[PDB]
From Swiss-Prot:
It comes from the Bacteria. The lineage of its organism: Bacteria, Bacillati, Bacillota, Bacilli, Lactobacillales. Belongs to the glycosyl hydrolase 18 family. The active site is at residue 141. Endoglucosidase that acts as a host immune evasion factor by mediating hydrolysis of the N-linked glycan from the Fc region of host immunoglobulin-gamma (IgG) during infection. Specifically catalyzes the hydrolysis of the beta-1,4 linkage between the first two N-acetylglucosamine residues of the complex-type N-linked glycan located on 'Asn-297' of the Fc region of IgG antibodies (IGHG1, IGHG2, IGHG3 or IGHG4), thereby preventing interaction between IgGs and Fc receptors and ability to activate the complement pathway. It is found in: Secreted; Host extracellular space. Its main location: secreted. The gene is endoS2. It comes from Streptococcus pyogenes serotype M49. This is Endo-beta-N-acetylglucosaminidase EndoS2. Residues 20-327 form the GH18 domain.
Amino acid sequence: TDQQVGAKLVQEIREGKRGPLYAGYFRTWHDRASTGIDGKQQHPENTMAEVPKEVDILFVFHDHTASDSPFWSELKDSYVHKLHQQGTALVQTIGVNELNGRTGLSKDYPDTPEGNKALAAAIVKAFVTDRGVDGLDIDIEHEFTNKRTPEEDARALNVFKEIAQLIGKNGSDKSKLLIMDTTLSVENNPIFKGIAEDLDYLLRQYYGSQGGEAEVDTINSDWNQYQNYIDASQFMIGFSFFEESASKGNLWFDVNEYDPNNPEKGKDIEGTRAKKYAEWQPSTGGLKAGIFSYAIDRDGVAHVPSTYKNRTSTNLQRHEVDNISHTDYTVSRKLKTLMTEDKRYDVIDQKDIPDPALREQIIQQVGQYKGDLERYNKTLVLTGDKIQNLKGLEKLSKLQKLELRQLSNVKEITPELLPESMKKDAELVMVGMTGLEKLNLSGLNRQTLDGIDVNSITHLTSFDISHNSLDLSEKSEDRKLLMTLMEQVSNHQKITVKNTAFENQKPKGYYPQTYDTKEGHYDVDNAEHDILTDFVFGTVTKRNTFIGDEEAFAIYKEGAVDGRQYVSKDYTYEAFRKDYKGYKVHLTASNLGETVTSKVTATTDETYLVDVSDGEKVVHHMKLNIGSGAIMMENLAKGAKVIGTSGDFEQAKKIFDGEKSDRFFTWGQTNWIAFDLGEINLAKEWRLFNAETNTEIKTDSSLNVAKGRLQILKDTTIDLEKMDIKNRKEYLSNDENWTDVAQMDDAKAIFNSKLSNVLSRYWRFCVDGGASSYYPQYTELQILGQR
Ligand SMILES: CC(=O)N[C@@H]1[C@@H](O)[C@H](O[C@@H]2O[C@H](CO[C@H]3O[C@H](CO[C@H]4O[C@H](CO)[C@@H](O)[C@H](O)[C@@H]4O)[C@@H](O)[C@H](O[C@H]4O[C@H](CO)[C@@H](O)[C@H](O)[C@@H]4O)[C@@H]3O)[C@@H](O)[C@H](O[C@H]3O[C@H](CO)[C@@H](O)[C@H](O)[C@@H]3O[C@H]3O[C@H](CO)[C@@H](O)[C@H](O)[C@@H]3O[C@H]3O[C@H](CO)[C@@H](O)[C@H](O)[C@@H]3O)[C@@H]2O)[C@@H](CO)O[C@H]1O
Ligand SMILES: [Ca+2]
């Protein structure tokens, strides 16, 4: 049956039996059965029926072919049958706009769960079932003119997931392929992230150069992200043949340019980007699935010369290669046979992995091809007692986790049997290694012995963990695990330095995760002190063994097990210690005033709150006292409510929030705000954050308040509510009804000064002049004191 054949073809592609794949997009209006809206033939020269068996998958790419064209029935009743006979599957391509509301059936269904569920089935029926093909391919590119909304992308994802429940590896009809083709990187492809688990293949268009000297920069950096959603065996990259009359912006030069001296040049793949894509392989994950071409009906036509690359719709520079001609798919055939002859697609065999049990588990988890070995960078779990030898494991050079589970018949582990990534902190788990006799991990920079079930290694007769990065200190858990392995060797043999080697360790240094001093003290000694030196200092090992300074490190280096000193002799404190390079110390005085310095001079009784930062996060918080200390003041003005102002009531309110992300100013050089602290307490200092402290708009100091006065209601006897609004405002504007408690006469970025222990429920601050002719601004006002 014609459905059964396609079903078996699709299953063999999805199971990976074709080796590397070659696919091509066939433009429907270049099939000789295609007819336009006027019912006339567009191009008699080519037909999908002549596409050769070297094309594993042929995509139907639609334009200009009219809905009533004979092409559709010719495709369904004729092309599909003949292409199936040779092993070629057919896939229909549609654009994302068919799914997001913008075109086709998408315009006839609501953006609702049941509407999108119904849209997906109508799409599958119209574009897959009714057309007679073997799968669906959704084309998702950047829309330059009219960007797609998040709701448009969210819907296409929902429809795509519903399609994935109808067809594909996770759909009820598994005889159809489900594919995406895209121009979008992971960070710009939210639909890909959501659908990637349901996709058979991802076809990444890479027409034209992709950056760097080998022209594949974007492919490598894209693959570094793509690999987290799909397998390398699902990744196809694409080049374009030369399309007739292509203009600036659609001129890729992926094939060889016209040669008036050689009409066959377009059929020569030497030197072409197409050949490079055939040969390119990802550097992690595995080998790719293959390559594809856009416009396979133009296979073999030489590219228009580089001199034409500036022609446009309105600036035509027609060339002989713009003519339509019959193709015999020579370039497609060459590219496919190049790939299938690539020996990196030879299957892993007895000579890579001698042990057949080891070989089987590797193949099941890393892939079937020799080229997968050195690329696979995930996790390998080896289990069972059938594995006797680990030779060849060293070939998974980028494995990031190796897990040896109950390998009762493995007698030997050596660096030469281990992936190179073991020298770079790859994870190493081994459990139930009851047959292991030699455990050699020397020279691997292992930072701990964690994951090694030393209790089960009941047969150990020698080990060498020397030249690692271990902490074998008294308290270190790796010293304890070492002793178990020395006990295991003892049960079989007299211990010698050689059969229990553990010397020349170089443990790496780390920042302590916390610091002990939560409340420091200095005497009033009139001297400078460094808060980093005294309170936030030192280095730890991976096992959290603290080393405060250089002589603590000199003490550490003499550490020994059974008289053997394990720290390498040439290992220096400066190689181990953390420099505190980016560290900044943030100080809040009892003032509430803030500074950034690690140095304090203990001249008078004071209290700081200390936040130490590493450049990105706070690593430690503590209190520092100098002499008797000093009680932290509160901003008594915080949240005070505004009672009157010559400016805007609502902008006046913002000088009492907590932030400097606002400004208060008026249409002039002077203004005032009167405010009510609500309560009554003792004010000892005041602080004004000037215009240049604005955090929401970079503000120059010419807008600073330069003169001003902070004042108190100088009555205390009156009721504000007794006045009504107009006179209230007028009273509060009258200079006679306030007395100065502080004067300001410098346009400092932050102005702070003391008050003779003022206490007044009611306040008013007056700007009297500015740094310049500009209207003076300030952002925040503080009144600082007790209770
Ligand atoms: C996998 C891949 O590479 N994908 C793309 C690919 O698009 C691009 O190749 C180009 O594709 C163009 C087709 O895309 C446009 O049209 C489709 C079809 O939509 C119609 O049909 C649907 C079917 O149901 C309808 O539902 C739909 O509503 C339309 O009526 C659109 O789907 C498509 O969508 C766009 O927007 C979405 C938004 O999300 C986006 O995802 C898409 O990527 C796309 O941007 C587009 O609107 C195709 O037209 C291009 O070929 C033309 O230029 C070549 C040279 O550059 C030339 O060789 C070729 O023959 C075409 O030239 C004809 O068409 C021009 C535009 O109509 C005319 O100006 C020309 O004069 C010429 O027409 C003449 O000749 C033909 C016969 O040859 C004749 O029939 C005409 O009457 C006339 O005489 C190009 O192949 C690919 C390569 O760059 O990369 C990826 O972007
Ligand atoms: Ca403010």
